[PDB]
Amino acid sequence: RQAITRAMADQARTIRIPVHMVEVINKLGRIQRELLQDLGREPTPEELAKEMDITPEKVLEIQQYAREPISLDQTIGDEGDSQLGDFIEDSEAVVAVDAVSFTLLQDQLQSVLDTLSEREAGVVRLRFGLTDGQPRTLDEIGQVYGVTRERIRQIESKTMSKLRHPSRSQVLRDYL
Amino acid sequence: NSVPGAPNRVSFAKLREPLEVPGLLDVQTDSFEWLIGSPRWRESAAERGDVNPVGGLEEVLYELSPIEDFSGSMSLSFSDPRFDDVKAPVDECKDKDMTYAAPLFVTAEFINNNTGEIKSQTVFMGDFPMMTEKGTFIINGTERVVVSQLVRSPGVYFDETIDKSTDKTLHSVKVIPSRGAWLEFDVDKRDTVGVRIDRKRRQPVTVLLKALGWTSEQIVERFGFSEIMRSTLEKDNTVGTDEALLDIYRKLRPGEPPTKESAQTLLENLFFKEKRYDLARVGRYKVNKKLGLHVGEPITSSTLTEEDVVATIEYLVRLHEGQTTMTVPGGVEVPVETDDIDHFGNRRLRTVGELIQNQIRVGMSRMERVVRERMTTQDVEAITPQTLINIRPVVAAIKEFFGTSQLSQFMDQNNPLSGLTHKRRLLALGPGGLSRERAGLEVRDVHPSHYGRMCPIETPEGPNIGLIGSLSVYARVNPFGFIETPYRKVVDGVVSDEIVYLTADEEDRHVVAQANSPIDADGRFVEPRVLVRRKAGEVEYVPSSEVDYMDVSPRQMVSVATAMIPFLEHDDANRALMGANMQRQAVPLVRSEAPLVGTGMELRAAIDAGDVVVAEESGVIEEVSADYITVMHDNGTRRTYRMRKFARSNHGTCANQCPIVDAGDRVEAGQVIADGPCTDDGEMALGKNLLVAIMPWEGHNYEDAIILSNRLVEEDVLTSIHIEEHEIDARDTKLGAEEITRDIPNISDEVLADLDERGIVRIGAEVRDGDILVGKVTPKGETELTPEERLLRAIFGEKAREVRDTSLKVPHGESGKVIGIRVFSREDEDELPAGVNELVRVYVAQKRKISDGDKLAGRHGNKGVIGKILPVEDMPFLADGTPVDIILNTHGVPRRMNIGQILETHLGWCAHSGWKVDAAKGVPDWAARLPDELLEAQPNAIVSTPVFDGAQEAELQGLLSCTLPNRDGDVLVDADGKAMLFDGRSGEPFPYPVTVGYMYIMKLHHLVDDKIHARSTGPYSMITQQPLGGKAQFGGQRFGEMECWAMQAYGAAYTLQELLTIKSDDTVGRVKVYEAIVKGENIPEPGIPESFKVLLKELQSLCLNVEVLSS
Amino acid sequence: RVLRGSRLGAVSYETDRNHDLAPRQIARYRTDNGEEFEVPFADDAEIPGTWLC
Amino acid sequence: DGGRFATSDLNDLYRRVINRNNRLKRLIDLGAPEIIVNNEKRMLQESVDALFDNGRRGRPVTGPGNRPLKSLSDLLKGKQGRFRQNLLGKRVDYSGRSVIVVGPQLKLHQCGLPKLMALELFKPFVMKRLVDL
Amino acid sequence: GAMLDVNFFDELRIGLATAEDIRQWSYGEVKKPETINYRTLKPEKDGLFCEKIFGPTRDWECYCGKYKRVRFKGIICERCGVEVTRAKVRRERMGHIELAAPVTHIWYFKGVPSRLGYLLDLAPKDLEKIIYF
Ligand SMILES: C/C(=C\[C@H](C)CCCCC(=O)O)[C@@H]1O[C@@H]2C=C[C@@H]1OC(=O)\C=C/C=C\C=C\[C@H]1O[C@@H]3C[C@H]1O[C@@H](/C=C/C[C@H]1O[C@H](C[C@H](O)[C@H]1C)[C@@H](O)[C@@H](O)/C=C/CC/C=C/C2)[C@@H]3C
């Protein structure tokens, strides 16, 4: 009976739950069926948390663990050919206007960096890693530039003051 | 008449019918209070005898009472189910989404056989969803209606076919019980028998005859005078009593050693004990009427008996020979006949009480199994019925029926007529019956006993034709679940006023005359040869002595909704079908004006639909208001009547209740005090009365299109109200908890200027598409950003805004003011779903004007969308200056055979302008049978033509002769019915006069913004990569198979490739298509579709090497 | 009305540079039945001598 | 929403095959009577058979509500299979639907269109044009 | 014949897949019936969603989160064991289950005629008494 209960705790759910949480789920379910029977009405979870001497938020987390998932292969619609798995909005998919917006933003930003000088563009590009994917620091930029990192910070403050013209960057204010 | 607040609707009704229309929702209410065992039902059933009337709950309990253990050591009874009050009132349950329940209390009692004690607890059985006043149920706030269902009654059905090969008419019989197994007595292709039982693949009569224990000579004195009995007595091939017992038993078991003594009793178990096999009291009455055995004794013995069994096989072999009538040894004779299932004597109606009783039965069985299970496991002197009984599967069965069944349904309530006709529907085949795809058209046809018992006109017009027929008007359900129909009995030619309610059986015992039959005004006919309905479903002429029953009235065979289509006897059945389906699809207008021409059914149909608040007790108004009516009764007491102003129905439409009485008004009992949605002055009103010309106008009314004047748009004549509900919830999550607030990231205060200080929009805020209703923000978490995003943030100084805005936005197209803010909170300690901290519902309402495309219809199925709303100046106007409102098409009238609408148009003009026929000769000849106080009429006076006794051609044209002028001396409409129209557009008079009049049309619930639906790029599916269709989303169009065929047939390869790759499934292709469009560059080449790669991966996963070769 | 879902994973939108990568070693692995496997580790990466191939 | 997970009914079959194979490997490395070993192999065989086609042999493996698990062959055969559905046709972008009315002044190569719908259809074209202007 | 999807084939040769081809296609033996951890909602190790087997769920993200950008590409994190790439190759890469005891495909066994019994000239019931033990 130990091996049977161990197997029913291990391999009886689509998501694996370690056996102690299955045990407290079964204790909660036993207490809940007993309370719905003998109370007559449905128990409140705060009363259940008093009953199992635990906190109601832990009771809610255990109930959240208790919900077994449903399948996607049930004929949920009124039509038998209608599938439940079709009617799911893929909220983690390509929104496809923001991608081309992002590409156009990249090109306009390249134009804006083209409107400035060479040292400025190199400093901002190597600073935020826009040209490669690696944000280097001011010490690396002064290493590749042969000047102090404090000079890089002064160049940084100059470029950020240069960027913060709304007359220059209304086209980038539009991009947010 | 006979209703105090009825409007003075004059009628053409020549026939005077003595029977009044019944209490239309009695089919729901009597069934449910039979299930309760209401005291009202108790005395009502004690009226018609029935010395032991039993509520259905008491029936299920007394069936289950008592429950033994296995060893006989103890017993558990059940006794007296009783109720408490309701848990909550109606609108409170509807608001808080609670089911309108009531507790069940049961005097349970346990008794030990060992020592002997009573254990008389009072077990609370469950909260029970009580029926409302209007015969409906409320489940989770929504209004739910259980529908009456038709099934074959349990009994013995002798049905025979003749084979195509040997031409031998083989005779089968299905003894189908309630709840049990199917034993049969068929006949094989030889001269043997098909007593093959519950599909046990071989059985003759003899093995059961000696499994009965009888001998071959005992077969001979039972089956004796047939080649069937000789050939089966020689084709027994298993002789011996207990030999046939063990033969039956080894056919029953196969897979185990048998035992002979169990073979004698398992036969008595599976058919003759009343513990697992019980055809009901209904089917037992059916059998005892079929064979005439239990004629002098009341209904009992719900299992089988061997006398009836051998009588059934004797009936089988005698109809196999062909006999006229059979008396059994021990029974009066009954006519030997076939059995047609479609006859209503064989089709019982399982109403809502029978359905709930079946679900209580299966719940009690599934808890009784646990009771018997734990009975042995529990120790003595330590138990009680509270320790024994699990009511959790019982309440699970009740809730699993009321939610998520087929028979439970949302109350289709866009108007009170659709409420009334979503009640009183009969579903012919479904759960507990045949499937829709399995059923042919023998169910779909109309058996000739449907006359008065089910309306042949009203049905869905889709694939479900004839499966869903409504109840008739005067029909009444039997205690046995049969459909009684009232009849005036005629004795010696004198038709009495003894109304007798008749089932289909006593319909077939007799012959029945018609209401259109000239009585002597003293009871007798004036002609000896009368139309009659022969009991074989035929029509004859008969001497006027032999008829014993007459119809109560005309319109007995028609539905409730179909009883409201005037001039029905001129219309065709197809267009009447479309009109009767079109009646219960109107939307309630803001004015809700009564039709100028109707039947006598509008008034009673309104006040019985429940959607009009009735003056309950006769009193005087103490105070009127807009929300309540304080009546003052004649003895001290007072009562308010809270109006439900702007309640949302189940289809978005409004449900206002404007009061109709004033301050000093004295009302009577059963008087209308407040019109509902589609009611005027008490009676029903599904639309407005409208001027109409029947000319074809400029191709805008082409192929059943309608045009309208702009006067409807400007004067708000056709204007519904659509209260739409939006609802969002504040849950918790893994990253924290969602919250509702004013703070939305990366957003301006301009869009935020309408919502309140805590996030919701205030009452009265006008919204548009894409506005915010509930400002809701969830914890996004913290992710790494793109460097360009980081650089823009560093330029503008803004933070990451680490919480994701997923706020409720009002979706596309919907607009209007915000009426109500229904908001709930878990912190406010209401009951809420698991994890939801706040639930907020927002009601938005738009006052939709009429528009081009809105599906309009008449009352005869003469439907059509609005083609073009013309301005009122270039609309063809009547010669006094009145512009007509709508202009139909002529060519849709004759070839659809619905000139009921033309007769209605003429009568509408007559009743609009008013008339006064001449009295110089008194009564002109056409006006003879025309009833009095109709020879004159004031203008704008309503009239009522009943269904099959109404206006006639001669009366209509003679009344259209004198049609008193408007204000001047101007008879605008000739005796032909037409009128001369000047063209509002050109200016010339139209060279031929045109039929005009006042048709009564409605506006249907098929409006354009419910349907207009477009998508460029929206959400996608999850597993497949297709654009997710459906108007709830942005939604594509299903480019189906035949469209692929057609675009193949054009040879357009490229457009097909676009439609199947880069508008559908090419994932990287779609963004490149979008990029090429907004960059203005050429559309790139379509790549491989995603669904094909899905197929490739599945076929690789099925251990199939799908090599795809290039060269 | 519409029920939505999200497969629990992050989706970015960048440029697939086949030129500007972190350079990397390749470690050849030999299993128990002599099977060769070439796991690409990074350059700056400790190579475990054992590896579930 | 609310964390309601949705499986795909093949994970249960895969879990059963994985579990039975692991158990069989454990019993083989342990040493067991051959009735047990052959019984586990038979269970593995029935599991694989139902994973490819549920209900092809014996009784179909079902789940909650006794609904049979949509196995691998079920994705191909039947009306819900890949072949019939892919032949049935897909929903498309840049589409839309509406009710129709008569157009008795239009020319023959012409159809009316509501601006509220044609705005939704031609959104990328109209975006490109009004960002060029 | 190349599966590199260049939209020109003119040929499509179905055929039986050998056990060598099945173990050739895969990316490691999935060996645990654990799909998603109940607490962290991340895929379990060597289970039916294991990112080392199939691929990462987050774009160019190793599972432990050491390497996280597209500069690290085509490599495998030595700690977490997940090759860094896009998320859409999780649609693509198959895994295999190794078996302790062999298995007969039901598509060659429950057919009319059973191709196994027709290759070995045996009854169907011979097969249902052999590979059901
Ligand atoms: C096909 C069908 C129902 C269809 C959805 C609509 C019926 C045909 C309507 C028509 O064309 O006239 C059957 O429904 C059930 C049994 C078998 C079928 O089940 C089926 O195949 C389909 C559904 C079975 C149970 C559905 C339960 C819940 O689904 C929602 C909520 C619950 O019930 C549904 C309620 C539908 C009410 C309809 O009412 C009709 C108008 C609209 O079509 C609907 C508003 C009215 O014409 C009304 O008078 C007719 C009611 C049908 C009578 C009894 C039906 C029981 C609503 C859609």
Ligand SMILES: [Zn+2]
């Ligand atoms: Zn990692």
